Amino acid sequence: SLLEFGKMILEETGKLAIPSYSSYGCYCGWGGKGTPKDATDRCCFVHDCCYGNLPDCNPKSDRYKYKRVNGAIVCEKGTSCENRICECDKAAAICFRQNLNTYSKKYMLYPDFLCKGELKC
């Protein structure tokens, strides 16, 4: 679920999902169009694609379980949708962590009209 994803994001990065990743660039929080602005935004682009791979799942609301082994996220077995959603979220949280070094506050609340063009998954 979105709330679980947000908790995972905070755990990984020390930033609150809202507002650090809920309106960032062209793809974080509200996706759609444009060339992703930076690596963090590309995390969101891929995450959006990842959810797009699951048209008959409901990642906003469906809850999954995960645990930590060391610092590593391990998705626990639920329904197939839950497993796949968890893997998408895990990847995005790791991706955010991997790209914290280039995160830029100037991309928060990034205006829609600067996000133009389709980019295929």
Ligand SMILES: Nc1ccc(C(=O)O)c(O)c1
């Ligand atoms: N910020 C970054 C960028 C690249 C890598 C990488 O392994 O290529 C990383 O571990 C962190």
